[PDB]
């Protein structure tokens, strides 16, 4: 029992591994009213608009 | 009095390390593995001075054989041909004639097959 790594992993390796941790930036749209930005199919967090006006102020 | 290391070890170290640029990974950044890599490098340097002298001869010979055979002659027969007619050329030079100057190499060929007759 008790596996353990045989050898330090190179800085190079370690970083090759990390080639996939890129965050994915939001696709962001600009609210058709109050004008800041929002997520598709969410309520625009600036005004509160989702066609008329749902969340409060 | 006491005498610390002060300054010497780091100078040695940087010496090795600075010999070692362009070495892959730790081989160029860690002292010990640098110094080590370098021992093996020693072997390779000395050896290959002799050995490159071995290698270039080879190359010349290849080219010579080629030219020889363009005009219907083997190399070996071409070289006894040259020694017979007491033409005394470097094979470095023979190669360069063979590669660079067609007609001239041709002339040496005819001279040599004459020396063979």
């Amino acid at each position: 029992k008790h596996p353990v790594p045989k050898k330090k992993t190179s800085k190079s390796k370690r970083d090759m591994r990390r080639s996939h941790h890129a965050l994915t930036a939001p696709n962001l749209t600009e609210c058709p009213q109050c004008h800041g930005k929002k997520l598709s199919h969410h309520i625009c967090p600036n005004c509160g608009y989702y066609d008329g006006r749902q969340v409060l102020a | 009095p006491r005498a610390k290391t002060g300054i010497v070890r780091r100078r040695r170290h940087k010496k090795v390390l600075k010999r070692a640029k362009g070495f892959w990974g730790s081989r160029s950044k860690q002292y010990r593995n640098a110094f080590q890599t370098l021992l093996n490098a020693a072997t390779y340097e000395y050896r290959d001075r002799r050995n490159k002298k071995r290698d270039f001869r080879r190359l010349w010979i290849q080219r010579i054989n080629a030219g020889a055979r363009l005009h219907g002659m083997n190399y070996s027969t071409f070289i006894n041909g040259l020694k017979r007619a007491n033409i005394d050329l470097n094979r470095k030079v023979l190669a360069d004639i063979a590669a660079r100057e067609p007609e001239a190499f041709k002339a040496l060929v005819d001279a040599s097959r004459n020396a063979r007759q």
């Binding site: 941790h21 890129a22 965050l23 930036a25 939001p26 930005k37 997520l39 | -």
Partner: protein, 127 residues
């Protein structure tokens, strides 16, 4: 200029569109994950993306972004509608260290790392 000292009197170094959060109690690789989205991007964008990125780090980084904005506008009289994140990076603060118990007698050391976030705003014309 004739003397180093002469220059040190005459010039004084400036940090044009630059802010730095020092000793942010976070981990660099984390904070970077956020930052790499911000970088190269035109300040407005950055301001938004930071509001919709759902990492913690997103917030300190928002704050430095604004500090660099208020340094390029105020202390440097630059042009908002032309600002972009010319450069941004994270380096390691002095990392907090604490003992934590483990099974049987063994003990361990957690590294609560810290962070230096740095943003550098700068105007962009194409020509």
């Amino acid at each position: 200029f004739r003397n180093k000292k002469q220059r040190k009197q005459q010039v004084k170094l400036r940090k044009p569109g630059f802010a730095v959060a020092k000793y942010v109690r976070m981990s660099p690789r984390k904070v970077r994950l956020v930052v790499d989205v911000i970088r190269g991007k035109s300040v407005q964008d950055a301001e938004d993306l930071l509001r919709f990125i759902p990492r913690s780090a997103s917030e300190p980084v928002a704050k430095v972004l604004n500090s660099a904005k208020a340094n390029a506008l105020h202390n440097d009289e630059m042009l908002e509608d032309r600002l972009f994140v010319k450069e941004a990076y994270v380096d390691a603060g002095p990392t907090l260290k604490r003992l934590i118990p483990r099974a049987r007698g063994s003990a361990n050391i957690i590294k609560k790392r810290t962070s230096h976030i740095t943003i550098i705003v700068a105007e962009k014309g194409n020509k």
